[PDB]
Amino acid sequence: TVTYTARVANARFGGFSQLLLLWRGSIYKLLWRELLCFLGFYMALSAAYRFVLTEGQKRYFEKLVIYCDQYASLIPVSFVLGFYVTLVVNRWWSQYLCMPLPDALMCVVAGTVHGRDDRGRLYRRTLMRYAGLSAVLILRSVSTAVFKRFPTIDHVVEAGFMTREERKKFENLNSSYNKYWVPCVWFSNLAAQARREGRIRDNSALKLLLEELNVFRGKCGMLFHYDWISVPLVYTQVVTIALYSYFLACLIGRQFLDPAQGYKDHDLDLCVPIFTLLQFFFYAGWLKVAEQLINPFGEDDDDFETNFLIDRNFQVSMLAVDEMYDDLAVLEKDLYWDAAEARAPYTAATVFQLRQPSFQGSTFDITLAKEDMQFQ
Amino acid sequence: TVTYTARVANARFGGFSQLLLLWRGSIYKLLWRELLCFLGFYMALSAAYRFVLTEGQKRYFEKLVIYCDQYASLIPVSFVLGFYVTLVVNRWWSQYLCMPLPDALMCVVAGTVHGRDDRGRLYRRTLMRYAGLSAVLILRSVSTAVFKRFPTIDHVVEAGFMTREERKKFENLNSSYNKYWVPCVWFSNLAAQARREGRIRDNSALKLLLEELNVFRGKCGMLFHYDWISVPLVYTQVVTIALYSYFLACLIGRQFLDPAQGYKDHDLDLCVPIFTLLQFFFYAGWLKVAEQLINPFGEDDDDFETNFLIDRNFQVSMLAVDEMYDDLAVLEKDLYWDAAEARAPYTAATVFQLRQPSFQGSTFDITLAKEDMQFQ
Amino acid sequence: TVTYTARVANARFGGFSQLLLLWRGSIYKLLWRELLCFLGFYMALSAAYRFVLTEGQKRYFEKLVIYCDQYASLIPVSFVLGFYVTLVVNRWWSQYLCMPLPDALMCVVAGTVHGRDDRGRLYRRTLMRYAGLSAVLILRSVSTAVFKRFPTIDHVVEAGFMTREERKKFENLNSSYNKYWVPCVWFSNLAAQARREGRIRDNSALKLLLEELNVFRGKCGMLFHYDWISVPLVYTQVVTIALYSYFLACLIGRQFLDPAQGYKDHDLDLCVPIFTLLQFFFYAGWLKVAEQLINPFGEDDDDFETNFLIDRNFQVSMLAVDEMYDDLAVLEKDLYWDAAEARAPYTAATVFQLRQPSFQGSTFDITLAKEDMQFQ
Amino acid sequence: TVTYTARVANARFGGFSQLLLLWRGSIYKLLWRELLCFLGFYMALSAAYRFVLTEGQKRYFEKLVIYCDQYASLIPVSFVLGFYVTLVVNRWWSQYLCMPLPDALMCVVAGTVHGRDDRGRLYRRTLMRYAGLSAVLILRSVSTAVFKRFPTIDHVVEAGFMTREERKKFENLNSSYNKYWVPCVWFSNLAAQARREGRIRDNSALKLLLEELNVFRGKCGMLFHYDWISVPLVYTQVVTIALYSYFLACLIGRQFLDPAQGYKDHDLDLCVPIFTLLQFFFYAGWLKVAEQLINPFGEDDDDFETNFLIDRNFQVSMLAVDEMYDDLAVLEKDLYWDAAEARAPYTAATVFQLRQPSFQGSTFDITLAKEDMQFQ
Amino acid sequence: TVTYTARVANARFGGFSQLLLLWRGSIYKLLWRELLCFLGFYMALSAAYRFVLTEGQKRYFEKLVIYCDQYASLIPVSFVLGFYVTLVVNRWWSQYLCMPLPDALMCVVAGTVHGRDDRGRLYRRTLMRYAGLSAVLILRSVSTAVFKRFPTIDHVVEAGFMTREERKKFENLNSSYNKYWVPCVWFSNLAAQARREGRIRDNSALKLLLEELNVFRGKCGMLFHYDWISVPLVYTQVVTIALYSYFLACLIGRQFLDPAQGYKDHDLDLCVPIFTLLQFFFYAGWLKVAEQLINPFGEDDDDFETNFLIDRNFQVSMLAVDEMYDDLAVLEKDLYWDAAEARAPYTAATVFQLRQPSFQGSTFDITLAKEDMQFQ
Ligand SMILES: [Ca+2]
Ligand SMILES: [Ca+2]
Ligand SMILES: [Ca+2]
Ligand SMILES: [Ca+2]
Ligand SMILES: [Ca+2]
Ligand SMILES: [Cl-]
């Protein structure tokens, strides 16, 4: 993930122009090799036309350039790229939202699984660890970074997500299918056991835990589904073929011809196709948007920071359900106890935000006449 | 936020034309500097062509202008801008909907956390304050205005959202990750304690509170996610490059050439490219839509009024759970107690809305024949 | 709201052509003034060119017309209008869906708040009235029609939505922010009181009421949010400027020039720009779609009938929770008690719908071979 | 509804070409009259030009044809049709999803409303019948087919959905608004009564029934909303005007002119405008998509089969809650009781689907090196 | 399903170019027959023009080619294909998400339906089997692969999803409509019976089971709805006609004419229309995207692997509710019990992901001045 939110807080004169100076996660880093290849092919053709071809060969080359320039139809490739890239971007955001987060479960577990003794701590920590373990098993299945961090289940055990006894039970299960779901079943069984032992004090609490477990588990399953059901290969091939067809038509049709021949719209030889290179950057970068986002669990600069999320989720979940269990500051009167109204102070830098009228609704400046307001 | 809803209540002859006279949050305020820069570059080129260049240099300049005018392809930039700006606008609205609001929690707390004594007031106020505190911690993390108002946790304490004892516990937590979630865990623990003490009278009430806490907390988390996962930098760079490429092609290709040379479509010298300036305003403003909306938590005119929302939310939540707790007007018979039907009166200005038929459904004017209506 | 659903039940030969004959909520009613203004400007220019200008002035005018006709680029304005109008239409439907309806609450209240005595009737009627009152307070804040009907809180009291004692409590609340939410807090308190008194017989019933109260209250809040957060002014200005730029280019470039001058594509003088007028109707009407829908709570023909909805909602809610409480027809055997199957009769006009095969699924005509169906 | 799912199970060489041979619900059936009218107007103009007009009149006609052919701008009409038709299609699917189905309620009622005696059967059947009755009342309000089947409430009574006593109560209710919601209030009251009598054994069961009742009732309400709030008439008029403007420009500008006059791009007289007729079919059919779908509750071939759904829903709901109540096959061990794993057999026709590797995740072929996998 | 997620983990120099080398689920496999047919027709016309036609016939053929090349309007077909294919792709993903999965139910059943004895195992296995059976009945109704695997209900019985006694009850039900829903009613009855016998220990548990049953059943129903309500046939016909019209215009208008005739833009005879073939591949493949996805339950390479999902779902559900019931590893202290913080180790290949700063929010680099931060 390349975060530039702070740079674009305000619409400024520099605006996105300053974003054009960034390298990490940039169009430049993704496209410079393809740009050099396109320029190399173009300049090889230009050099052959200028120095190698005979007069007859040059005349035929000019006819082919004029013919090919007709098929450089940008409007259709723009259509398909717009639709396809928008599909990939929407799917990318949907995939991010399917990342399993323990926050809802950790709040419910902290509020529902009780006891300051070691057994209560074991119940809470084990429930949150099962959630973390499911997340790790699915992520190592779908994320190259996570897999490289956990290339075998032995690494999951050594990392503390799974115990050796848990690993014995996990491997003894006869299944040819991915077992990311197993810790969710463990969670359900352990929650039922906690309710049976009175650690969960009510049936409604157990229902809430199971409701939140299924939300978490469904997010894990959604990651599996996105990983399995690629964007249809035919669609990806269609868009790639359209883009490369346009690039072929430009590579031939955008050649600078001898101005002496006096061909229509060929009277200037700049020797470098500046606007064609800008068009190539535009269109190829537009497709590179999809190329980077189509699998966001790789190691691209703008791919999701899955290992960071595993670490954050585990650390925060353990804090919430172990260190913060029943550890409230004493109930005390707040600063605004004696004030019927309340408003926090403003800094010198933000007090200007005051004196903007408190919006009440769009209708409170109509100012009707007396006779109009009387009920029938 | 620049609210103009009242101005556009009706489709009028003036309509959006009157909106063209607004300055705050306007295209003009966002784009006048870029418009002056574009006009300056254009007029510098025009002045060099008219007064500096020699005849040969002028002929070459005319060839370059004619060549460059071919690549001013507006249709592709329109495509990419449409798709990209629509993505940014949808994301902007989604981000607004993720703003944490205490209204659902304040209704549930007012209805479920009981006692007119000081301890009941402490429970209700502390629960709502925890919600407000989570909102402040995330907003100061994602909003420049809120951060400038709360540049340190000391400011949060002095503003009354967090207590000194709460601050001690908050800082003692060993976490390298953002702690906006901590008050939600405090809320869960305090709700469990209130249920244990009988302040919350039923398990279903506690479940409802925890359900609403997780909705609120999820909105906080969503703000964090939007702040972290920028719109992919490559996509922003692609659209910016497309727009600036079109601007380069226009800056060269829209130059007024000497009509004496008799170039095709160059026979009028207006000395000011009026339609190119209007196109620049159109396209650059279209992108400025995204530039303003890409981070709605800045200090732009149309950015969200986050400090106003913090103040409103805190004040209303405290009113709802403290002043309005168990403070009902006595149950009394309403004006329409003795009327089988009921309808409120209309004013002289609105009685015309009556005599419009009460819509019953689209099918109640078919008026079939007698023989058609008989069951088989 | 202009309902034409009945006219378009079937795709007919007349089809939408007949819709072109409608006036209420029509393109004609919204655009005839702008059409006359455009035609007036066009004909003023035409008259000046034909009768006022000298020969030299006419030649310069012809050059300006030919120059301006080049910038009448409809493809870009089509893009921006498509994206912007689609955004406004989607937002319009979303706003309609945020209209608070008491139906869910009235069903729950009728089923959960018990007693045929006056006190039960008071509880049920007061709960539904609180819902209605919240809807009225928000609608009068966001709707010009509703505001004109309830220009002051005194009108809300005289209309029966709020009692005088309720008004005393309502005004005594020290809040600078809109108080539409207050009756929802009253509802929560009154539901808690009803549960405490045994009028609500179970905790799950109270939870259901509070769950439905928050859905209703959230819809009220959503109306406030839509009213406050306009479609970004910059975007509206951009689309308006694009449309008016195209109109300027057409007003100059579509002038009929003297055919004697023999300009390319200027050999016919129809004296009335029929196709330009049709294009103006098309594009200006396309934008008028957004102009009408951007604020659907005004007094346009196709704006929402908010006063009708207030009346319907109040009347139906009171019927449901008061007249229909515990007023069931005696449980009796239905017409199909003794029939294992069942099907209602068809009329002579609809019996043709029978003899269409009952769809079972797409796979039930594959008709595989014997050898293929045997399990391995 | 015209179901062709079976014909398009696989992408085949014939593919959609075979779909071009279908008549029911076809473009041909919807558009042949308009195609004949367009061809008649075109051929009338052609005949007048070829046989009636004088030489001078023919020269003026040629100038008008050349002028009109310039305004046949397909790109703008394509834009507006794309956006508008996509809106109508999305709304069409949304409306289908709002069709009230009793399946969720019938499962809950079968599982929660108890007793094999006549009184239990009466409770279950009456609850499901109330759901069916609400569906019939709304559908007869919004569907021409259903209305023709139930043109009066007397038909609803004779069909068995409503009883005579129920009809007395239904008509005695003083409401000027549609009463489709009344049976939902009856359902709520009857569910409360069943809980009070112990037929519903728990408060959570009653809550579940009321939760599912409100989902069903909300779908009924959504049908009412879609029926009432048409797609804005101005938008429909705008798209229709754009299409008909293009058709006018084609009807004049696509006339075959005398090749002898040697007009540019007029050298071939085919006497039948084949490509213009194909364009008319394309664009007019594109709009006919919306014309058919804008009200899906009519009697078009592809309109929803509402009467079939009423019959299916009633029959299945009665089966589920009456014949299938507490009628389980005895709990017996399944075929895979003694198998730790399990997999159903494959047929000779489907066994080829085996030997495709069981997908485990995208990361399980990375095959890292030994040194890379060691924890830090 | 053709999964290529692993190939596109990173945006690479090869990128989608390497995807152009794939055959299974490729554009090539779907389109080579149509490409050969188009090329055959084109070359037949070319051969007739070059070798069969007389001089007069060749001149007329040249006029027809020039005339037809004018109507090869790609911009409109691009529009309709974009909108239509996007609709089909969104519907395809929606259909995938409606595939019934037992995971949520298996977690709830494992946690709520109790007993290590044979009767508990029978309850859990039978509930999960009912879910699997409903999925099989709907899938065999909508999926050609599943139907070929289960061409009769006898195959469902022999496969173990349905028992012989269950089959007797199933066939005795008098219904002309699809019975996929029957096992869901069986599930509801059996869950009620388990609650009555005390196997389900609480009312909230039973509610949770019924809530998850209805989610599962609704997904089954959604598959039925998608199977029944095809994408409107008129829309499919419109897009197909537009594409084939463009193909006709290209087949005639893209013919290579004799360069000697000196027609404008006809001076090169390549004898093979390379760019027209690439355009045909682009557009025909774009439509083949929809052709494959319109019914994803067929036997295309990229159609859903429904039989694999049936096998996986059944096997995993049985494991979860039978082998894993109350089979927890003993509660033991985790690796991070004594650590206030926690972080799993990194491998040599992934440790580089560390030293990237832990994102705290976009506002934590503003660095305001001292005087600005002071509260008013
Ligand atoms: Ca990637
Ligand atoms: Ca901003
Ligand atoms: Ca309006
Ligand atoms: Ca219809
Ligand atoms: Ca298929
Ligand atoms: Cl619940």
Residue numbers in the entry:
A (entry chain C), B (entry chain D), C (entry chain E), D (entry chain A), E (entry chain B): 2 to 377
What do the study's own words say?
The bestrophins are a family of Ca2+-activated anion channels consisting of four members (Best1–4) in mammals. The overall architecture of hBest1 and hBest2 resembles the pentameric assembly previously shown by KpBest, cBest1 and bBest2, and retains the two landmark permeation constrictions, the neck and aperture, in the ion conducting pathway.
To elucidate the architecture of human bestrophins, we purified WT hBest1 and hBest2 for single-particle cryo-EM analysis in the absence of Ca2+ (EGTA), or after a 30 s spike of 1 μM or 5 mM Ca2+. Under both 1 μM and 5 mM Ca2+ conditions, most of the hBest1/hBest2 particles (~90–95%) were in a Ca2+-bound closed state, which is very similar to the Ca2+-unbound closed state. In the closed state, this region is well-ordered and wraps around the circumference of the cytosolic domain, extending clockwise around the channel when viewed from the membrane. As S205 is conserved in most mammalian Best2 homologs and Best2 is reported to conduct HCO3− 21, the dual conformation of S205 may affect the flow of larger anions.
